[PDB]
Write a protein that binds this ligand. Structure first.
Ligand SMILES: *[C@@H]1O[C@H](CO)[C@@H](O[C@@H]2O[C@H](CO)[C@@H](O)[C@H](O)[C@H]2NC(C)=O)[C@H](O)[C@H]1NC(C)=O
Ligand SMILES: *[C@@H]1O[C@H](CO)[C@@H](O)[C@H](O)[C@H]1NC(C)=O
Lengths: 45, 79
């Protein structure tokens, strides 16, 4: 059938990260103190 | 007498009361368990946790329900 003869040639058909930033959540930094020496002073006076 | 009553009801010792202390930077630390009842955070209140630590939100034999209107996230003991 010559009517459905198809010819095709070459053509030019030419058509991940994860991150979220919150603002802050710092813990108790510099965790050290004492309430004896000052108590000793104010109970030694 | 009333000064002794003030000393004793808050249970103050030579170090201080066995409830809390005011860290000099303003950080209100506490010293033992807390029963806060209801809590209504108003302004800039992000419930977090300490560095390199895990929030452990456990319900001692009670469910936990994240509710919003109709939407529910219910984590019960077996469902
Ligand atoms: C979670 O466990 C509880 C306690 O067993 C369940 O409550 C009852 O459990 C018994 C035996 O497992 C059943 O015969 C009853 O019918 C349960 N009552 C109700 C109201 O559920 C409960 O069902 C369990 N939940 C799930 C999702 O398994
Ligand atoms: C190609 O074949 C189909 C199916 O038989 C037919 O419908 C169509 O008309 C044919 N095309 C031509 C150009 O004859």
């Amino acid at each position: 059938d010559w009517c459905n003869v198809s010819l095709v040639d070459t053509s030019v058909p030419e058509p991940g990260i994860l991150e979220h930033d919150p603002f802050f959540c710092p813990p108790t930094e510099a965790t050290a103190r004492d309430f004896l020496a000052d108590a000793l002073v104010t109970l030694l006076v | 007498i009333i000064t002794l009553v003030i000393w004793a009801v808050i249970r103050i010792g030579p170090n201080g009361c066995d409830s809390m202390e005011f860290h000099e930077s303003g950080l209100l630390r506490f010293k033992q368990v807390s029963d806060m009842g209801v809590i209504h955070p108003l302004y800039k209140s992000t419930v977090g946790g300490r560095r390199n630590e895990n929030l452990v939100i456990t319900g001692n034999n009670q469910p936990i329900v994240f509710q919003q209107g109709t939407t529910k996230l219910s984590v019960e003991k077996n469902k």
